[PDB]
Amino acid sequence: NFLELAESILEYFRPYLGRIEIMGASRRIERIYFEISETNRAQWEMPQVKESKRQFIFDVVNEGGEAEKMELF
Amino acid sequence: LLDLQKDMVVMLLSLLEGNVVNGMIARQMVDMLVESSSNVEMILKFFDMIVGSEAFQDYVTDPRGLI
Amino acid sequence: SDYFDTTPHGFETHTLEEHNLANYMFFLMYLINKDETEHTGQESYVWKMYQERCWDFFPAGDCFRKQYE
């Protein structure tokens, strides 16, 4: 309720409220949150940077899938 | 003040990195945000604020701004 | 693979640190290159069953992780 009251802020920062998961220190999976520059939520979109990610996933799925599959990333 | 604001919440964000799902330490955080319900409602509704820029375009007077 | 991904990394370890195919061969070297008197009860067992070609000793289904918690 308190957050349904607060929706607009989450709606504004949703695009560039970064988040991931880590197996951090405590062995349990922490979910960290981090700022993303709005330039970073743009530069990664239009250009080669998408297709490079596609080339990447193509170069992993077809070649990795193993102990390097995190590292290569 | 706003600078300080960040730091305050930042400590809270340094207070939540270690959480389980229903950890005590977090639900005490919800417990304070609800203890300070409307009182926090005010800070969050201070963030209604560019944003309103288009409404100036709705009845702009002389390009510099002014309404 | 899917059972063994429940642990981190996992299945690649199970194919190396565990069964890793090869070590059964090294162990079959180790039995054949070892005095019949010198065997341990485990190794004597595996040697005996190996002589009888019963081949039960290869894990099947169960592994050390399946067996335990």
From Swiss-Prot, chain C:
Give the taxonomic lineage as stored in the record: Eukaryota, Metazoa, Chordata, Craniata, Vertebrata
* Further remarks about this protein from its record: Binding of [3H]ryanodine indicates that the heterozygous channel is activated by Ca(2+) concentrations 4-fold lower than normal. Single-cell analysis of cotransfected cells shows a significantly increased resting cytoplasmic Ca(2+) level and a significantly reduced luminal Ca(2+) level.
Which stretches are Cytoplasmic in the membrane topology? Answer: 1-69
Q: How is it modified after translation?
A: The N-terminus is blocked. Channel activity is modulated by phosphorylation.
Domain comment text? The calcium release channel activity resides in the C-terminal region while the remaining part of the protein constitutes the 'foot' structure spanning the junctional gap between the sarcoplasmic reticulum (SR) and the T-tubule. Pore opening is mediated via the cytoplasmic calcium-binding domains that mediate a small rotation of the channel-forming transmembrane regions that then leads to channel opening.
What this chain does, per the entry, is described as:
Cytosolic calcium-activated calcium channel that mediates the release of Ca(2+) from the sarcoplasmic reticulum into the cytosol and thereby plays a key role in triggering muscle contraction following depolarization of T-tubules. Repeated very high-level exercise increases the open probability of the channel and leads to Ca(2+) leaking into the cytoplasm. Can also mediate the release of Ca(2+) from intracellular stores in neurons, and may thereby promote prolonged Ca(2+) signaling in the brain. Required for normal embryonic development of muscle fibers and skeletal muscle.
UniProt source species: Oryctolagus cuniculus (Rabbit)
| Positions annotated to bind ATP | 15-21
Q: Where in the cell is it found?
A: Sarcoplasmic reticulum membrane
Family per record: Belongs to the ryanodine receptor (TC 1.A.3.1) family. RYR1 subfamily.
In which tissues is this gene expressed? Answer: Detected in skeletal muscle (at protein level). Fast- or slow-twitch skeletal muscle.
Where is Ca(2+) annotated to bind? Answer: 37
**Complexes and interactors:** Homotetramer. Can also form heterotetramers with RYR2. Identified in a complex composed of RYR1, PDE4D, PKA, FKBP1A and protein phosphatase 1 (PP1). Repeated very high-level exercise decreases interaction with PDE4D and protein phosphatase 1 (PP1). Interacts with CALM; CALM with bound calcium inhibits the RYR1 channel activity. Interacts with S100A1. Interacts with FKBP1A; this stabilizes the closed conformation of the channel. Interacts with CACNA1S; interaction with CACNA1S is important for activation of the RYR1 channel. Interacts with CACNB1.
Q: What superkingdom heads the lineage? A: Eukaryota
Q: What is this protein called?
A: Ryanodine receptor 1
